[PDB]
Structure formats: structure tokens, C-alpha cells
Amino acid sequence: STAGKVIKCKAAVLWEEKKPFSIEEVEVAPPKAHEVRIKMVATGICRSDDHVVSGTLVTPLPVIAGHEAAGIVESIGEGVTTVRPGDKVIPLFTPQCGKCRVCKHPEGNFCLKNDLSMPRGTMQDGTSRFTCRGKPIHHFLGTSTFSQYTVVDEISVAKIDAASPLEKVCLIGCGFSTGYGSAVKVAKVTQGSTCAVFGLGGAGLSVIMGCKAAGAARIIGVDINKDKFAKAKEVGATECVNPQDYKKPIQEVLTEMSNGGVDFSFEVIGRLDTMVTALSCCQEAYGVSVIVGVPPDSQNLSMNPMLLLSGRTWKGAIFGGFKSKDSVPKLVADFMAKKFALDPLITHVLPFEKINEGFDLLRSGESIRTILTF
Amino acid sequence: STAGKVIKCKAAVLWEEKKPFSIEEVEVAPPKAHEVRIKMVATGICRSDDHVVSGTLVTPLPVIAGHEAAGIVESIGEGVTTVRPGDKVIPLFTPQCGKCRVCKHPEGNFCLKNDLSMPRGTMQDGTSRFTCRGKPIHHFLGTSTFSQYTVVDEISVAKIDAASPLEKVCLIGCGFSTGYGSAVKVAKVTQGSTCAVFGLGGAGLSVIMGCKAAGAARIIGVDINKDKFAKAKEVGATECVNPQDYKKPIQEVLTEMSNGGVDFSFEVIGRLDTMVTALSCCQEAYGVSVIVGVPPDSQNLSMNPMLLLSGRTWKGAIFGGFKSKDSVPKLVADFMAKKFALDPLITHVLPFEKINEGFDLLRSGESIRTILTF
Ligand SMILES: NC(=O)c1ccc[n+]([C@@H]2O[C@H](COP(=O)([O-])OP(=O)(O)OC[C@H]3O[C@@H](n4cnc5c(N)ncnc54)[C@H](O)[C@@H]3O)[C@@H](O)[C@H]2O)c1
Ligand SMILES: NC(=O)c1ccc[n+]([C@@H]2O[C@H](COP(=O)([O-])OP(=O)(O)OC[C@H]3O[C@@H](n4cnc5c(N)ncnc54)[C@H](O)[C@@H]3O)[C@@H](O)[C@H]2O)c1
Ligand SMILES: [Zn+2]
Ligand SMILES: [Zn+2]
Ligand SMILES: [Zn+2]
Ligand SMILES: [Zn+2]
């Protein structure tokens, strides 16, 4: 069978910036020492993938993007002890080597072996596993889920429940976990608290789920797209405001609504301006603000430090602060137990081939999550 | 007696910015309802006061500054219940109305009654007590301790032990408590951590006393004035670095020293650039950076949101997050029990009249805390 030999398959290769993904045949080389080749079953369309198209998130092109997914191990490389063939797995865009200061810390999850801070677009050995039209194709976040077949490092994959609905749990590989964790793990939303979530897409709604799970009495969803309101309220938002419906600045509106600032604000969009607004909207003397949205490349935000001096707490986080490899298998199990629901995020289920349509659905604000089935 | 009548005494009136504190005769009106008039025994020269002069910290002028102090209750107004004449008290530049949102909050301390964010430079009733040259002089943070007698609203004053050495505990009015709290309360330094303190002044040194008290195994002090090193080490610094001695930006040097970044970083200077540096020096995935230094009025800082997205926590606080009226008496009580040393911050003792010279020392870097006696 396929094990031990280069696997030709279709993948969504991104050649240039701001250009459509090109579904072509790529050569997926076999897994080397401590690498895992996974047959993709379902990949979700996260806004971060679109960020690479726009240039918001700089990474080496050409590249096979995608990181939010779930699949089954085709074959494992030499030295792989954590997964075996036929294992349902979820590629972790944030690895967990377990050997670094961050992995040994009880609170940090951002493993230094991450290829996010300073993208290279390779495996941990610095090489590529994809070849297309001769040219070597770079990897995205050590995952590259936009391919019928992919190869990841052992530290960037987790074995999940064998009876898991991959088409649904793939969201745990990013969107859900991120939002959920940003709520209960990073910010640690309290019982009776008031939260303001900026951005109501896959991650935003997931923050609402986390706020509600934590017992937030009042949850305010903030989106310039009213079509996102209906769902936000469905997942926990107690109300929704549209910045472009008023004349005065939103923080004024939010300040007045919350009566002096919210307990928790979440920036789940990825804009420097809304990041400052989220900070401002949390109570000056004890408010917590968490930045979930990935900011535009090389761009700095200008803010007044007095926002902090007064007593505010500003935070940010990758994968909801969840230690990916230890958490993902645990999050899937909890989904199996039905502690949380991924269905509200799934709005469009298309074939891998329609990847570009799904992206257009995202871009038009018509979709939350588009699940590409392989 | 003077109880019930205007008291003519001397005060340090700052008529214009960047001008000397004119020691002249001002009239102090008797305390109105729920107000308290205190006889100043000793007041500490805090950099925040110098800020008022230089214009860094804005408040209505002409003003009688001063906020770090201790004195005795001369008389109380109608309805005052918390203090009685003859009581040794410390003015709280940060009020504790015990009614507002932040006061009712379990961990908030920047009471809304404060006069820091929106400086009115008056009492709670919007009126002043000071008269000089016939001109009504402003109050500073509702304390105005640069006068032999000042009128503070009841919520901005706390009764400390009758056996408290006022000339030493006046440091608990701000300096010490700020830094100590910033470390032990706001940041919550863990046992065995590596702390990096920016600025080795009275406040900075107190932050060191906090990390040291918290169990911080390492404490790197940062200052462009090498002379401040000896005392830092004396109070807790494991080492101290003069940024000017390096060809590469200090944050890098700090990251290198701590093997990836510090656990807790502190900014006790008040510069925008140093704030960004302190944040960047703490470990990107679990670093906590606490800003204490007051920034130049209306000035914004440009920072990279990725510093936060990775996992850093950035926060600030006024008075070390301590609920003034609550903590203050206890902090004095701890000093009574020899729980922390105040002496190390006291380098010069000068009579109130030699006020300018005290500011000279500060500005020349020849001092930490110059205690003014009356
Ligand atoms: N740090 C992490 O671990 C992590 C994980 C997942 C996603 N993200 C990031 O979070 C952000 C959102 O992800 P998503 O999949 O939910 O995206 P999305 O496109 O589904 O949602 C973004 C939402 O914010 C709204 N919005 C845009 N501008 C707005 C504005 N000016 N005011 C108010 N609302 C506005 C949009 O209408 C949209 O609903 C992205 O930047 C993504 O890259 C980060
Ligand atoms: N947040 C609060 O409630 C609060 C309370 C007290 C003081 N403060 C503020 O904290 C700051 C410091 O207070 P302080 O009382 O310790 O004063 P200070 O002047 O004695 O301390 C400042 C120290 O930092 C050093 N320094 C200056 N520039 C530096 C630089 N570029 N790099 C490194 N070191 C540098 C100075 O040499 C000095 O030793 C002030 O801005 C003050 O207003 C805030
Ligand atoms: Zn690691
Ligand atoms: Zn994502
Ligand atoms: Zn209050
Ligand atoms: Zn002070």
C-alpha cells in the first residue's frame, strides 16, 4: 500500500499572495524519524488561513495552508510512540514538545518549537515534505491540513477518541479550543461577570460558549455584521451591538451599556484598532482584556499606557492557552460526553475541492465555519 | 486652639510648571462635613510630585502637591466617624469610598472617587481649602501633603497605629506600598522566579523588597545610573545592569540572562520605551509585566501586539493594587512587627522648608527617599 512511498494527492497550493488556492497534485513524501503522515478527513476553514492569502500573517509561499483539522494516521515514521496507523488524530498548529521551559511551565502552552512567531514553513528538521511542479512546497504552522495527505512532527499531533466524529471535532484543532480557552483558560471568566466579545465568527462564538460555560451573567457580542448576531445569541450572547449603527465611538456605547466597563473583553477579529477598543472597554481598575485575533504583519498598535496603570489586565494567547497535545484529546472526550457543542459553528460542509468557495463564503461574511471533507 | 478656624501656616505652592515650590504662607480652611484636617509630621518626596513640576503628570495649578505622608488629626468635620483628633493618619492619594464599583470589587483598588485620571485638583465637593495671596490654591490627589496642614476628605485618610514612627511610615503612603504591592499583589511573584525590575528608585527598590519577599530566586535590577546598584543589591537585587553598558538593546540581554525571558518584569520609571522593553524581557508565553511608572501626559506608546498574542500578560496599578484605607493600617502594623524594612529607602532627611533641595537631590540622582520633617 501507500506506506513507505511518496503519495501523490490533491492539495490546495497557495502560490502567490491574494490569489486563489490551486487544487493540484503534490508529492507527499513519507514520514521520516518521529514524523506522522495523516490522511485528512475533515479540515475547517479558519480565518488565519485566509490571513496568509491577504498577507496579514506572513509565512513562506508557496505553501499548503490549513491547520484546523482531524484525520487518521496513514503511516508513522521511525520512533513514533504516541500514534499508530489507523489512529484518528488532530494536527496541532501549536506543538507540545514537553521538553522546553514553556512546556514544563504549568501555565504556558506556546511551545518554542512553534513556527508561528518566526515562520520557516518546514518540519522540525527544517525541510519540506511537499513537492509540486518540481518546486518544494512549504508547510503552514507545522500542519498543512489543506491536502488529502500531510506529514507533521510527532509533537504536533494528538490521538483522539476512536469513535470521534472527525467532521465535527476538527474544529477543536483551532477555532473552538481557541475561543473556549481564551474564555475559561486565559481570561478565566467568572460567575456573574459581564463580557464583550469583538468579532463573532468561529472563534468569537467559541469565546461566547466559554463565557457562558463560566457563568458570565452578561455577554455582549460586537460585530459590524448583524447577520452574526442571531447565532452569537444562540450560543450565549445576551445582546449584540453593531458599531456602525450608532454615531459615537463604540467604547462610549459599551462603557454606557456595561456602566463603566465590562469585566472581560475579547478581541477576536485581528485589527489593531479593535484591540485597543477591547482593552478600553474592560473596567479600568480591574478589567481583563484578551487578544485572540491575529494582528496584521509588522504592525504596531498605539495605545495610552494609563489604560494599564489604572488597573487593567491585557492578555493574548495561542490555542486558548491550551497545551495542545495534552488538551486536544481531552477536549474531544469532553465533546463525546457532550459538555460543549461544535454544531453551531458548522454552517457549510463542502468538498475539499470547493475550498475556494468556502473561502469566498468566509470573505462574504455568510459563513462561520466551512468544513471541507476529503 | 485652631480647631474650628482658619489656620495660617506654610506650604509648598507650585504656581507654574518647571518652577520651584514657593514656600509661602497659605490659609487652610477648617474641615467641612465629612472632611479631616491633618497636621503634617513628615512627607516623602516622590517622583510623581516632580512630574507635576515638569508637567509629565497633569493636575490644575497653582497647586500644593505632596501625597506620600503621615501626620496627626487636628480636627474632623461633621459626620466623620473613622478618625478622631489626635490620631496618627496617612493620607491616601487613592481613595476608598467603599461604595463605588471598584471598591466593592474583591481585587480592585483604583476607586472611582480618585483624582488621578481626571484631575479636578480639589476636594470631593469640588471646592478648595487653600488660600494663598488671596488666590485659591489647588489640591493634589486630594492629599496635598506639602503643607504643614492640609484638609483631606474622609475617604482619603486612614488611621494608623498610635505608635507608628510617622517619619518612616510615611513611605507606606505611596513609595513602598506601591512597589511592594506591585510585586506581591499585582504581579504575585512566585517562589523561585526570576524578576527584572526597571528603575531603582524608592518605588523600584520596594518592588525588589516584594520579589525578595515573594521568594523570587533572581532579581535583575535595571538602571542607567550605576550608583543605584549598591542599595538594590542590599534590598534584594541578585544583579543589576546598566543598559548603557550594552551595544544591544537591554531586553535582549535580559532574555539571554533569564534563558528565554523573565517570569515577572516591572517598569518603575515612567517611560514609554522602557515599558515596552520590560514587557518584551519577560517570557513571551507566560511572562507578566507590571507597569508602575507614570507616563508623560497624553502620550501613547507603539507596541507589537504579538508580544501579547504569544501569551504575555501586561498590567498596571496605582498604589500597588492595595485598597488604600484597608491595607494602609495593616501595612503599618506589619512594619510594627518588623515585617519589612522602610529604612533602606530613606537616604536624606530635610526640614519641610528645604523642600527644593530635596527635589534637587532627586533630580541629580543623589537620593531615593528624602523625608521632609515639619
Ligand atoms: N490566537 C489563536 O490561537 C487564534 C486561533 C483562531 C483564530 N484566531 C484569529 O482570530 C480572528 C478571528 O477568527 P475567526 O475564525 O473567528 O474569524 P471570522 O472572520 O470568522 O470572524 C471575525 C469577525 O469579526 C468581525 N469584524 C470585523 N471587523 C470588525 C469590526 N471592525 N468591528 C466589529 N467586528 C468586526 C467580522 O464580521 C467577523 O464576524 C482572526 O484574526 C484569526 O486569525 C487566532
Ligand atoms: N503607580 C503608582 O501608584 C506609583 C507610585 C509611586 C511612584 N510611581 C512612579 O514610578 C516612577 C518612579 O518612581 P520613584 O519614586 O522610584 O522615582 P526615582 O526617580 O527615584 O526612580 C527612577 C529611577 O529610574 C532610573 N532611570 C531613569 N531612566 C532610566 C532608563 N531610561 N533606564 C533605566 N533606568 C532609568 C533613574 O535613574 C532612577 O534611579 C515615577 O514615574 C513615579 O511617578 C507610581
Ligand atoms: Zn515545548
Ligand atoms: Zn486558527
Ligand atoms: Zn470607591
Ligand atoms: Zn507616589
Curated annotation (Swiss-Prot), chains A, B:
Dimer of identical or non-identical chains of two types (E and S) coded by 2 separate genes at different loci. Its main location: cytoplasm. Keywords: Acetylation, Cytoplasm, Metal-binding, NAD, Oxidoreductase, Zinc. Binds 2 Zn(2+) ions per subunit. This is Alcohol dehydrogenase E chain. It catalyses: a primary alcohol + NAD(+) = an aldehyde + NADH + H(+); a secondary alcohol + NAD(+) = a ketone + NADH + H(+). Its EC number is 1.1.1.1. Its cofactor is Zn(2+). It is found in: Cytoplasm. PROSITE patterns: ADH_ZINC (PS00059). Pfam families: ADH_N, ADH_zinc_N. The modification N-acetylserine is found at S1. NAD(+) binds at S48, G199, L200, G201, G202, A203, G204, D223, K228, V292, G293, V294, F319, R369. One of its GO terms (molecular function) is all-trans-retinol dehydrogenase (NAD+) activity. It is an enzyme of class 1 (oxidoreductase). CDD domains: alcohol_DH_class_I_II_IV.
